[PDB]
Amino acid sequence: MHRIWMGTDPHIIMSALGSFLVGAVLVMHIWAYGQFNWPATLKAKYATP
Amino acid sequence: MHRIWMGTDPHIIMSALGSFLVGAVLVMHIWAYGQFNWPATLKAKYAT
Amino acid sequence: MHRIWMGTDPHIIMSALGSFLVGAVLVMHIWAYGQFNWPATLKAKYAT
Amino acid sequence: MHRIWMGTDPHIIMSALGSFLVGAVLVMHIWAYGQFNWPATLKAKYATP
Amino acid sequence: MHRIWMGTDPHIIMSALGSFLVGAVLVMHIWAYGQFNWPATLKAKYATP
Amino acid sequence: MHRIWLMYDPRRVMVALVGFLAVLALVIHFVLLSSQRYSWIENGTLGADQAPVGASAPAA
Amino acid sequence: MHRIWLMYDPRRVMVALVGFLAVLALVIHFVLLSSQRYSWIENGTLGADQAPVGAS
Amino acid sequence: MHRIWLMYDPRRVMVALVGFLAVLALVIHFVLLSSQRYSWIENGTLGADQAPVGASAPAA
Amino acid sequence: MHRIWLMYDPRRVMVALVGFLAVLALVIHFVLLSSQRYSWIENGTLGADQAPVGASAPAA
Amino acid sequence: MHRIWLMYDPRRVMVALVGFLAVLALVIHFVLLSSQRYSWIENGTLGADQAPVGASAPAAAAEMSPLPPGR
Amino acid sequence: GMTEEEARRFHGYMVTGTLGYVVVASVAHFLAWSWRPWF
Amino acid sequence: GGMTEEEARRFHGYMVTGTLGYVVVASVAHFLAWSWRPWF
Amino acid sequence: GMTEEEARRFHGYMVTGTLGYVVVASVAHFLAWSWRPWF
Amino acid sequence: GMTEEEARRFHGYMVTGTLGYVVVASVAHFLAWSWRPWF
Amino acid sequence: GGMTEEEARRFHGYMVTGTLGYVVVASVAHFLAWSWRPWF
Amino acid sequence: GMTEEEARRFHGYMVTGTLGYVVVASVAHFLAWSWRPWF
Amino acid sequence: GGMTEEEARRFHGYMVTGTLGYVVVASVAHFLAWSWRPWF
Amino acid sequence: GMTEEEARRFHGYMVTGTLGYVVVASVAHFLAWSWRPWF
Amino acid sequence: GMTEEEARRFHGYMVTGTLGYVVVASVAHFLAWSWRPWF
Amino acid sequence: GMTEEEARRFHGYMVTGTLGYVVVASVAHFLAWSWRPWF
Amino acid sequence: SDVKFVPADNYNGSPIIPTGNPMIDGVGPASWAEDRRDEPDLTYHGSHKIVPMRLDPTFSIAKGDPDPRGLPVIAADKQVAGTVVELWVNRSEPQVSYYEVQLASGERRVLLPTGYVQWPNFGLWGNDKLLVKSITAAQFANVPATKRDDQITLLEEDKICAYYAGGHMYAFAERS
Amino acid sequence: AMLSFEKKYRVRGGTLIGGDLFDFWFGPFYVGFFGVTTIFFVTLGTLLCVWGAAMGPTWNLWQINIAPPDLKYGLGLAPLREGGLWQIITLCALGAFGSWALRQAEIARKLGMGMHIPWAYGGAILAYTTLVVIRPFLLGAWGHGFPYGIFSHLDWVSNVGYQYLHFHYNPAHMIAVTFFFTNCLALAMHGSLILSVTNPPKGTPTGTSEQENVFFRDLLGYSIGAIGIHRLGLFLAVGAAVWSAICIVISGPFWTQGWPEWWNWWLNLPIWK
Ligand SMILES: CCCCCCCCCCCCCC(=O)OC[C@H](COP(=O)(O)OCC(O)COP(=O)(O)OC[C@@H](COC(=O)CCCCCCCCCCCCC)OC(=O)CCCCCCCCCCCCC)OC(=O)CCCCCCCCCCCCC
Ligand code: BCL
Ligand SMILES: COC(C)(C)C/C=C/C(C)=C/C=C/C(C=O)=C/C=C/C(C)=C/C=C/C=C(C)/C=C/C=C(\C)CC/C=C(C)/C=C/C=C(\C)C(=O)O
Ligand SMILES: COC(C)(C)C/C=C/C(C)=C/C=C/C(C=O)=C/C=C/C(C)=C/C=C/C=C(C)/C=C/C=C(\C)CC/C=C(C)/C=C/C=C(\C)C(=O)O
Ligand SMILES: COC(C)(C)C/C=C/C(C)=C/C=C/C(C=O)=C/C=C/C(C)=C/C=C/C=C(C)/C=C/C=C(\C)CC/C=C(C)/C=C/C=C(\C)C(=O)O
Ligand SMILES: COC(C)(C)C/C=C/C(C)=C/C=C/C(C=O)=C/C=C/C(C)=C/C=C/C=C(C)/C=C/C=C(\C)CC/C=C(C)/C=C/C=C(\C)C(=O)O
Ligand SMILES: COC(C)(C)C/C=C/C(C)=C/C=C/C(C=O)=C/C=C/C(C)=C/C=C/C=C(C)/C=C/C=C(\C)CC/C=C(C)/C=C/C=C(\C)C(=O)O
Ligand SMILES: COC(C)(C)C/C=C/C(C)=C/C=C/C(C=O)=C/C=C/C(C)=C/C=C/C=C(C)/C=C/C=C(\C)CC/C=C(C)/C=C/C=C(\C)C(=O)O
Ligand SMILES: COC(C)(C)C/C=C/C(C)=C/C=C/C(C=O)=C/C=C/C(C)=C/C=C/C=C(C)/C=C/C=C(\C)CC/C=C(C)/C=C/C=C(\C)C(=O)O
Ligand SMILES: COC(C)(C)C/C=C/C(C)=C/C=C/C(C=O)=C/C=C/C(C)=C/C=C/C=C(C)/C=C/C=C(\C)CC/C=C(C)/C=C/C=C(\C)C(=O)O
Ligand SMILES: COC(C)(C)C/C=C/C(C)=C/C=C/C(C=O)=C/C=C/C(C)=C/C=C/C=C(C)/C=C/C=C(\C)CC/C=C(C)/C=C/C=C(\C)C(=O)O
Ligand SMILES: CCCCCCCCCCCCO[C@@H]1O[C@H](CO)[C@@H](O[C@H]2O[C@H](CO)[C@@H](O)[C@H](O)[C@H]2O)[C@H](O)[C@H]1O
Ligand SMILES: CCCCCCCCCCCCO[C@@H]1O[C@H](CO)[C@@H](O[C@H]2O[C@H](CO)[C@@H](O)[C@H](O)[C@H]2O)[C@H](O)[C@H]1O
């Protein structure tokens, strides 16, 4: 399968993969914070009455 | 059957198929979240 | 029967047919979802 | 009768005939769905009460 | 693994990493101050009636 | 595919692309800023259920 | 078929096509954005039953 | 009939044709979108029994 | 990535960039200064909870 | 960081910078002089608690309107 | 300038594209007719 | 230019095979649809 | 000018790119139609 | 006039920059959606 | 330029064959339709 | 573009990746069906 | 330029290793998340 | 017109100058946010 | 640009810098958890 | 034209000029702040 | 066939294509009014309107302008085409009408209409050379001649001006 | 058909876009790419004006009136029957006027002329764009544009003038009027001088640059010269349109009181307050 990398530059591969991962991870957290009600339970734990 | 790939560029085939799959999966998930009422039931499990 | 393909381009044929199928299948599903009341019955099952 | 075709590119004949047939078939179905009350009876069979 | 750095400029790498860390750390603190109710509880400790 | 950059001078294309995106971004931001729903400078701190919504259809 | 590109330089047609499609897309969006039914920036969160219809 | 392409340069008859069809298609759509019966963006979801029909004043 | 500076003269790009950034900064400051919530010359000393907020959805 | 002085002629930069700073200084002074809170020639002697502050909210009465009715 | 052979070749495409365009327009009119008749 | 008569013969075999495969799969789909919700 | 084999090469790309654009647009209409039908 | 190998390396950056731009916009939209969704 | 009489002669064979095939399938469709919802 | 030799090799990986994708999707659907069946 | 078959073979080994490392850490994360707040 | 080494030297200052500005601007936004949040 | 020998030494510092930074952060999180646990 | 020695010696006066100006402006701001704060 | 151009194709309204060198033959923007009267233009009292300045001592450079004589002329290809030997003046409306240029690396002297010259920095400062953006230093050798060096005819004016006019289209083209 | 000297000049080249494809003539007209776009916008914009007349109350040429939308629509496209059609025609007009100027640049390049004519026409385009784009944008509604109708746009001009009580007192308007009037005087003088030397009384020799120079100096007390009078005409004519664009863009976006009370600053100069 390693034939697939031929002709490419490693820095471009690692740029592309690096940017994709930053995107997906950020999106997945922004989404997960909406659904799981966290940190909202954390905030409500320490919030001042 | 392989010789349909002759004269193509494989990095373009992988670009087209990659673009299709990313689009198709995202369309299917936003459609499915509408029909299946999930994550809506997940959000309702942890709320106030 | 086969020689209708002479002088044609295989990728143009597969592009044309591929795009026709996508159009037809999308039309057929959107129409069929209207007539058969699905996924509407699916959505109603798991709605709250 | 075959001498009809002699002036002509067979791909043009197929393109022209294929255009006509798609056209006629679609017009006939759109028309027939109006007159025969189908798929309207199908839709009524499964519509939510 | 070190071969990833070949062809790059050390100062661009340190400049980019440094700017990332500043951005990430600032985001993380303003976020964390929101969730953990600090320094808000610190201010309330020493504030005047 | 990279041979597209033989058809056009990339030095020219990038200037056209940046121009198009800069104008488009300014147009979208101005459209949103002029709306009710997304006039975020005055109302950005409102919660999503407090933010304006356009009128619905009449009941009959 | 392909001899059309012997008459019209595909390098130039492809630019004019991008220009045409960009203007057409902008016109269709600005038409819809200004309608009542499809003013999606103000009302996009309305359900399809709630969305305006231009009856009078 | 093909000899019309000896009278006129096909390269620029086709531009004239495509330009004509563009102008004619746009005019007809704008004419309809001005009408009440065919203002389809606002009222396209109405069935034919609800679609506007124009009449003259009843002239009592 | 540095070969971008062979396509474009950095003596041009520096002057272009500073011209762009200065204009963009002045636009944003005057947009904020013209707003109500961020008219900071007159109202800057208001606390965050006292500063103006745009109209909500009224349900009325 | 001297190499900028080969990249551009110091006379033209020096004039351009001084021109920019003078224009900016005049703009900021006149924006302030036009304001209520910082109209220092008339009100500069007021204490910090006495100086104008922009409203936390404008006032209204339902029957009153600043603009005439129409269209 | 094109030969009368090239003229016949071009004219074959021009007729075929015209027919295809008219077919599409005909279906579009019959869809429009079924949605909201104009006579 | 374009496909030779040899390429045409060879291509036609795959074209027919792919078509018959597609129609077979669609036939299964319709049998399942009919047994789920008959439409006549 | 351009040779007929370059024209035949470009025609492959142009047809594929055109139809791919129409496919993406057809999906966008499927989303728009599901959200708020216009008929 | 750019060579084909210059185009080859240039395109890699153009793809990378486009992907990076789309990634940042995708996060920007997801943040905006979480703050105030438009559908 | 187009077709000699010889390939036209075999093209005609496929044209008549395809037409008759289409008319047969359409005949079955009308027989099914008539049994389902007669229109005269 | 690709040779018959490159096409032969590329096709094998393409078939393999396609089958792997379908297999994973088959497990995904079996899980989804057991969780919330839709017919 | 562009990566050779020799260099690609070496690069692929790290890429596979890094991808497995990432998936392993994410597998731990999902186990912790599931035991903390199950989502089905 | 830049040589390779001239462009590569300039690119160092250009990257760091850009990133330094963005870092300063991010502190400015942090301060502005703590004074009067816009969301 | 950076040679392999520079890259070899550079990598050793970058990894040890990274590990040190993670060590300090791990202590920070241990302290933070003992002060205000968040799960 | 400007030499590298000229630039170096010019930069010294340019930096003390800028620094002296920033020193005066910051004293002027803190006087203004003490008289009538804007936050 | 001496005919200077042929149709691009047989359709109505098609362009013409030059056969020879369009700058020499005079086609498109290089063309001139070929029937123009081949006589000098005259002042109201009937002297020659355009003459070299050495023939009328009434005229002199305005004090504190540069005299352009002896300056190099820099052509479109940045080559030095020559140096200004003389000014020609309009006696009906006092102005410089033509520079006369001694060609560098050649025997010949040629006229240069001042509309096609510009100063470095548009004359405000420097003024140490002349710029001719429209033609190359090679093409300066083919600039049309006047029959005499003390006078210029209306036809010769048209020919010379048309030569520099065509350059902006044809100077950097293989169409020669 | 061609002028008896023309064929010689009909070369390829000078096009800004489209290469050789559109580089041809249709009768007297040069086409080119912006010729094609001109005819597209002219045809569409004209046929929409005919549609505006059809759905309006009358076909009388003077009375046809395609009005802009109400101000309440702001910067949105109104319903077509309520001013939206005026907006589409405005986009056509901008496209046509822009294409026309760029087509003139191709023609000037093909003849080896300077660009003076496209830029002069740019002054008219600027004034139009100010009336229908820039001023309505600064006011925040496209409904501030003028209606397309031969007399109905004069009703708009009248009412906009009296929005400032006494529009004659607009200072930029006074300058613009002075350019328009001085331009008409200069055109009469230049036209008369050229004609009077080229058409002397019967049995008199054709005149000379010296005679027109002498007569012009008797009229103004100085000699403008042949290049100068064409520079002056262009300066006056284009300057008139530029000062016109200024005078309308300041009215509303910048000054909102009556124009007479603008002159209060002159009365209050400290030398005589
Ligand atoms: C209010 C104060 C200020 C108001 C200010 C008003 C200013 C008016 C300025 C414009 C007037 C001059 C226009 C002109 O001469 O164009 C050339 C053209 C043709 O003649 P040619 O050029 O000498 O010869 C060429 C031709 O023979 C062969 O050329 P070719 O074979 O290559 O091309 C084909 C032909 C076909 O002809 C046409 O297509 C033109 C038909 C329409 C002409 C309308 C002219 C305007 C009349 C206005 C007066 C009135 C009409 C009612 O030739 C062409 O292609 C030529 C195209 C010319 C396009 C000119 C368009 C001008 C539109 C002006 C609109 C003015 C709106 C105000 O001339 C004509 O067709 C005849 C025009 C004669 C002047 C009008 C006099 C009317 C007097 C009263 C009625 C007389 C009845 C007998
Ligand atoms: C000089 C060559 C490199 C560089 C080399 C280093 C080195 C070496 C170190 C850092 C460190 C840091 N760098 Mg630095 N860094 C550069 C450019 C930047 C840029 C930028 C806008 O370009 C930014 C935002 C940063 C940001 C940062 C922080 C994330 C971090 C903590 C100190 C700090 O705040 O420094 C702000 C940055 C600056 C004011 C400019 C950079 C130079 C100054 C002198 C600071 C860093 C050196 C530090 C004092 C060394 C101390 C001794 C060691 C601890 C043994 N660097 C330049 C291009 N950077 C330190 C770290 O990793 O901490 C965990 C560290 O040890
Ligand atoms: C408001 O209501 C109002 C408006 C007022 C009411 C009134 C309306 C009126 C009056 C309407 C009039 C309409 C009209 C009247 O005629 C309309 C006439 C329409 C016509 C004719 C349409 C024709 C379309 C033809 C097409 C699309 C052809 C396409 C050709 C193609 C694709 C092939 C291209 C060539 C190729 C591929 C290869 C060439 C080979 C080469 C080069 C080779 O081999 O060398
Ligand atoms: C709802 O109301 C309304 C809408 C009215 C209802 C009505 C609807 C109607 C009327 C529908 C009609 C549908 C229809 C017909 O009638 C639909 C027709 C469908 C058809 C035909 C589908 C065909 C599919 C074929 C496929 C997938 C083939 C794939 C082939 C492959 C993969 C092989 C590729 C080639 C190779 C490998 C060659 C190698 C050698 C090479 C290259 C060499 O040798 O060079
Ligand atoms: C209510 O509002 C109103 C407005 C009134 C309503 C009405 C609206 C109307 C009437 C609309 C009409 C629309 C219309 C009409 O036809 C719309 C027609 C649209 C069309 C045709 C779209 C076509 C798109 C084609 C595309 C995108 C092609 C992309 C090609 C690509 C990417 C490949 C490029 C080439 C490569 C890469 C190879 C280079 C060579 C290489 C590398 C080499 O050689 O090596
Ligand atoms: C109100 O709502 C309305 C508005 C109406 C609705 C909207 C409607 C419409 C119509 C929207 C349209 C959207 C659109 C349509 O196309 C949007 C299209 C967007 C696109 C394509 C974006 C592309 C971005 C690409 C970028 C950023 C690339 C960056 C590249 C970089 C950084 C590398 C540069 C090179 C370098 C560094 C050096 C290389 C090496 C070299 C040189 C060497 O080595 O030599
Ligand atoms: C509702 O109200 C209203 C509307 C009013 C009601 C009334 C409606 C009316 C009046 C309808 C009339 C309909 C009609 C009238 O005629 C309908 C006519 C229909 C017809 C004719 C259909 C014919 C179909 C033919 C087909 C499918 C042929 C396929 C052939 C194939 C596949 C082979 C191709 C060739 C090959 C392979 C050989 C290559 C050899 C080569 C290259 C070589 O040998 O070199
Ligand atoms: C909700 O309502 C609506 C929307 C209506 C519902 C309906 C939706 C519908 C109709 C959906 C249909 C979906 C569909 C239809 O077909 C879906 C089809 C999906 C398919 C086919 C997926 C295929 C995936 C294939 C993959 C992942 C392959 C990966 C290959 C790899 C990794 C190898 C790469 C090559 C290598 C390593 C060798 C290089 C060597 C080289 C270069 C050398 O050696 O030179
Ligand atoms: C919430 O609703 C919605 C959003 C809808 C839900 C759905 C979400 C969906 C659909 C998600 C899909 C996610 C997904 C896929 O499908 C995600 C895919 C994830 C992947 C692939 C991750 C891969 C990570 C790989 C990493 C980190 C590699 C690291 C490499 C390292 C450390 C080594 C580098 C060293 C080198 C290079 C040195 C060698 C150089 C050498 C030798 C040299 O130079 O020579
Ligand atoms: C709140 O909600 C949301 C936000 C969603 C929550 C989620 C947040 C998320 C997902 C966060 C993820 C963060 C992350 C992910 O990876 C974070 C990763 C962080 C990393 C990698 C930190 C690395 C730090 C490294 C340092 C400090 C290195 C220092 C190195 C030094 C000093 C040596 C320098 C070089 C030298 C000495 C030169 C030698 C020789 C040379 C030059 C020669 O010899 O030439
Ligand atoms: C509410 O209002 C709105 C407006 C809306 C709010 C917003 C405002 C905004 C956006 C503001 C932005 C501000 C800004 C942005 O960059 C501001 C930037 C300011 C800067 C860069 C200031 C720099 C000053 C430097 C000076 C003064 C240098 C003096 C040097 C001297 C004296 C030495 C001269 C040389 C000598 C003596 C000898 C040389 C040697 C020689 C010759 C030799 O040795 O030969
Ligand atoms: C060529 C590419 C085309 C891409 C697709 C673009 C959209 C075109 C859609 C055409 C098919 C429309 O098909 C039609 O969908 C509507 C959607 O309201 C269905 O309408 C019915 O079901 C839907 C739910 O599905 C209900 O919300 C609706 O109130 C009811 O009337 C019709 O029963 C069906 O016949
Ligand atoms: C507009 C954006 C939306 C997406 C648009 C594109 C989506 C679909 C892309 C499918 C990619 C594969 O599509 C296929 O690519 C190959 C090259 O790989 C093209 O192949 C073309 O170029 C190759 C190589 O230069 C030639 O040998 C060949 O004769 C020619 O047809 C095919 O003509 C096209 O059918």
From TrEMBL, chain G:
Coiled coil: none annotated. One of its GO terms (molecular function) is metal ion binding. The modification N-formylmethionine is found at residue 1. It is found in: Cell membrane. It is a single-pass type II membrane protein. GO terms for cellular component: organelle inner membrane; plasma membrane; plasma membrane light-harvesting complex. Bacteriochlorophyll a 2 binds at residues 29, 40. Residues 1-41 form the Antenna complex alpha/beta subunit domain. Bacteriochlorophyll a 1 binds at residues 29, 40. GO terms for biological process: photosynthesis, light reaction. The chain crosses the membrane at residues 12-32. It comes from the Bacteria. Signal peptide: none annotated. Keywords: Antenna complex, Bacteriochlorophyll, Cell membrane, Chlorophyll, Chromophore, Light-harvesting polypeptide, Magnesium, Membrane, Metal-binding, Transmembrane, Transmembrane helix. Antenna complexes are light-harvesting systems, which transfer the excitation energy to the reaction centers. This is Antenna complex alpha/beta subunit domain-containing protein. It comes from Gemmatimonas phototrophica. The chain holds residues 1 to 56 of 71 of the full protein.
UniProtKB/TrEMBL annotation, chain J:
InterPro entries: Antenna_a/b (IPR000066), Antenna_alpha (IPR018332), Antenna_alpha_CS (IPR002361), Light-harvesting_complex (IPR035889). GO terms for cellular component: organelle inner membrane; plasma membrane; plasma membrane light-harvesting complex. Pfam families: LHC (PF00556). The keyword Lipoprotein does not apply. It is found in: Cell membrane. It is a single-pass type II membrane protein. One of its GO terms (molecular function) is metal ion binding. PROSITE patterns: ANTENNA_COMP_ALPHA. The chain crosses the membrane at residues 12-32. The keyword Ribosomal protein does not apply. Residues 1-41 form the Antenna complex alpha/beta subunit domain. The modification N-formylmethionine is found at residue 1. Bacteriochlorophyll a 2 binds at residues 29, 40. Its main location: membrane. Bacteriochlorophyll a 1 binds at residues 29, 40. One of its GO terms (biological process) is photosynthesis, light reaction. Keywords: Antenna complex, Bacteriochlorophyll, Cell membrane, Chlorophyll, Chromophore, Light-harvesting polypeptide, Magnesium, Membrane, Metal-binding, Transmembrane, Transmembrane helix. Antenna complexes are light-harvesting systems, which transfer the excitation energy to the reaction centers. NCBIfam families: pufA_517_ASD (NF040861). This is Antenna complex alpha/beta subunit domain-containing protein. It comes from Gemmatimonas phototrophica.
Automatic annotation (TrEMBL), chains K, M, N, P, R, S, T:
Keywords: Antenna complex, Bacteriochlorophyll, Cell membrane, Chlorophyll, Chromophore, Light-harvesting polypeptide, Magnesium, Membrane, Metal-binding, Transmembrane, Transmembrane helix. Signal peptide: none annotated. One of its GO terms (molecular function) is bacteriochlorophyll binding. Its main location: membrane. It is found in: Cell inner membrane. The keyword Nucleus does not apply. One of its GO terms (biological process) is photosynthesis, light reaction. Residues 5-39 form the Antenna complex alpha/beta subunit domain. It comes from the Bacteria. A bacteriochlorophyll binds at residues 11, 29. One of its GO terms (cellular component) is plasma membrane. It is a single-pass type II membrane protein. Bacteriochlorophyll a binds at residues 21, 29, 38. The chain crosses the membrane at residues 15-35. Antenna complexes are light-harvesting systems, which transfer the excitation energy to the reaction centers. Belongs to the antenna complex beta subunit family. This is Light-harvesting protein B:885 subunit beta. It comes from Gemmatimonas phototrophica.
From TrEMBL, chain V:
Keywords: Bacteriochlorophyll, Chlorophyll, Chromophore, Electron transport, Iron, Magnesium, Membrane, Metal-binding, Photosynthesis, Reaction center, Transmembrane, Transmembrane helix, Transport. One of its GO terms (molecular function) is metal ion binding. Pfam families: Photo_RC. The chain crosses the membrane at residues 29-54, 114-138, 172-195, 232-255. Fe(3+) binds at residues 190, 230. The reaction center is a membrane-bound complex that mediates the initial photochemical event in the electron transfer process of photosynthesis. This is Reaction center protein L chain. It comes from Gemmatimonas phototrophica.
